[PDB]
């Protein structure tokens, strides 16, 4: 146990074990040899000072020990010559996601082993390497991990409702929250009050510009006929009937309500905890209806296709501002067909509803 260039007797942990040749060099001689090789000699002269030692990944391993036992100015020239004489560009520096160690990696493979934690990771997505990722894109791999994380599927449809964010229509801030039972949403960043289902504005007192509105002196909004503001009053069975008639599948069984809400604190995360009835996919009643309405909105299903005459007359006075009147010779089917025809032609679905 002694330095191979000066003979100084030191323990093994007092010297530097050169990885390429395992010739132990004391700290001072290791330092002084490699600076004069950088100061007066060329990059090819960075050979070991003890032994004799075209695979030049030796610079990647030497860069580690050079970073430790060298001055910053001398370590800067080593990088300068490495790019000005070997690489014609900066070296690719990789950070290990599991141990936070930085190292130069200039190899062929997509997998890279950390010289510290000795774990292998993909150079693109920086996730830990597995045999499943071989031959697959990183997008395919991390989705296979999400499709195999027991704690992720245990949350159930709560993750689906949170994936559908609430985007503020004016400040565009994204909130990874479920809409819940109440449609009113106040954005912390811009103080905008809007409906979380149709993204229309909640007008204050005497600020509503819509014509023929009879509640202008009150806080309110105007919602399309397919917004959750209205479809929340439908029963789960009738919401499912609109889905079944268009061959849209929906969950009834799970594949307190675990849908994450926000708790007011001097905001904390808190589960819904409401009763999860049978046939509601383990969700709350309001959160299950939100789940069905999102399916309805995604496929742009028209709830007016299930309207009866009284509902069609209410919709005609609301969105067309004309009290309908049956014409002579019409039966209930014809009167219903005419009102449904005019509504679907003149009043579209939610133009701002997230689909």
């Amino acid at each position, epitope marked *: 146990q002694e330095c191979a260039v000066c003979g100084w007797a030191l323990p093994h942990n007092r010297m530097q074990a050169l990885t390429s040749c395992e010739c132990t060099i004391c700290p001072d001689c290791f330092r002084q040899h490699f600076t004069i090789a950088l100061k007066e000699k060329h990059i090819t002269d960075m050979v070991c000072p003890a032994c004799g030692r075209q695979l030049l990944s030796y610079f990647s391993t030497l860069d580690i020990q050079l970073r430790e036992s060298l001055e910053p100015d001398a370590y*800067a020239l080593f*990088h300068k010559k490495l790019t000005e004489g070997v690489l014609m*560009r900066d070296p*690719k520096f990789l*950070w290990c996601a599991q141990c*936070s160690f*930085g190292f130069i990696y200039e190899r062929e493979q997509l997998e890279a082993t950390c010289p510290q934690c000795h774990q292998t990771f993909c150079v693109r997505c920086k996730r830990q390497w597995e045999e499943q990722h071989r031959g697959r894109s990183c997008e395919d791999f991390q989705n296979w991990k999400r499709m195999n994380d027991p704690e992720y599927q245990a949350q159930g449809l709560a993750m689906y409702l949170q994936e559908n964010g609430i985007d503020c229509p004016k*400040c*565009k801030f994204s909130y990874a929250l479920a809409r819940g039972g109440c449609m009113h949403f106040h954005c912390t*960043q811009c103080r905008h009050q809007f409906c979380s289902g149709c993204y229309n504005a909640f007008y204050a007192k005497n600020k509503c510009p819509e014509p023929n509105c009879r509640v202008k002196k009150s806080l309110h909004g105007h919602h399309p006929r397919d917004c959750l503001f209205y479809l929340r009053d439908w029963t789960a069975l009738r919401l499912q009937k609109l889905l079944q008639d268009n061959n849209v599948m929906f969950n009834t069984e799970p594949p307190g309500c675990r849908v994450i809400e926000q708790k007011e604190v001097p905001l904390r995360d808190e589960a819904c905890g409401k009763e999860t009835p049978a046939g509601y996919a383990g969700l709350c009643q309001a959160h299950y209806k939100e789940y069905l309405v999102s399916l309805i909105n995604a496929h742009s299903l028209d709830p007016a296709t299930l309207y009866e005459v009284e509902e069609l007359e209410t919709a005609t006075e609301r969105y067309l501002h004309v009290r309908p009147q049956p014409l002579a010779g019409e039966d209930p089917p014809a009167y219903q067909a005419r009102l449904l025809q005019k509504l679907t032609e003149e009043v579209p679905l939610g133009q701002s509803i997230p689909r």
Partner: nanobody, 120 residues
Framework: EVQLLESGGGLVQPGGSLRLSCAAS????????MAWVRQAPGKGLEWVSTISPIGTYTYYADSVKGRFTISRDNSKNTLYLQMNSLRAEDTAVYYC?????????????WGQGTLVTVSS
């Protein structure tokens, strides 16, 4: 001693553009990476982008890819940050930072920072 001075911050209308600067001194500018980090209201530090010593590689956080462009001019020891399509969530104090190769520290020093706000 390392010294960094940011400049270019201000009030920007939503969707506008802005270019930040950083003058460095007290160390060899060519021999280190440079990075931008920002402090959102009530938060700590969020990594924004990183550029290699001579600009060979440029990295970005996912929320700024395609909108931000990092560049440097080693001839004047200056770091630049071009910011396009500024949104309200980009409101933060942007800090100039000097990179490092040491373990666990992608940067060792960061400046005083310049404030950038996006109107609603």
């Amino acid at each position: 001693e390392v010294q960094l001075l940011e400049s270019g911050g201000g009030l920007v209308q939503p969707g506008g553009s802005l270019r930040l600067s950083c003058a460095a001194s007290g160390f060899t500018f060519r021999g280190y990476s440079m990075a931008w980090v920002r402090q959102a209201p009530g938060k700590g530090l969020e990594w924004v982008s990183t550029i290699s010593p001579i600009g060979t590689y440029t990295y970005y956080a996912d929320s700024v890819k395609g909108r931000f462009t990092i560049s440097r001019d080693n001839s004047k020891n200056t770091l630049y940050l071009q910011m396009n399509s500024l949104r309200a969530e980009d409101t933060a104090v942007y800090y100039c930072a000097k990179g490092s190769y040491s373990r666990g520290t992608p940067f060792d020093y960061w400046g005083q920072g310049t404030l950038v706000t996006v109107s609603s």
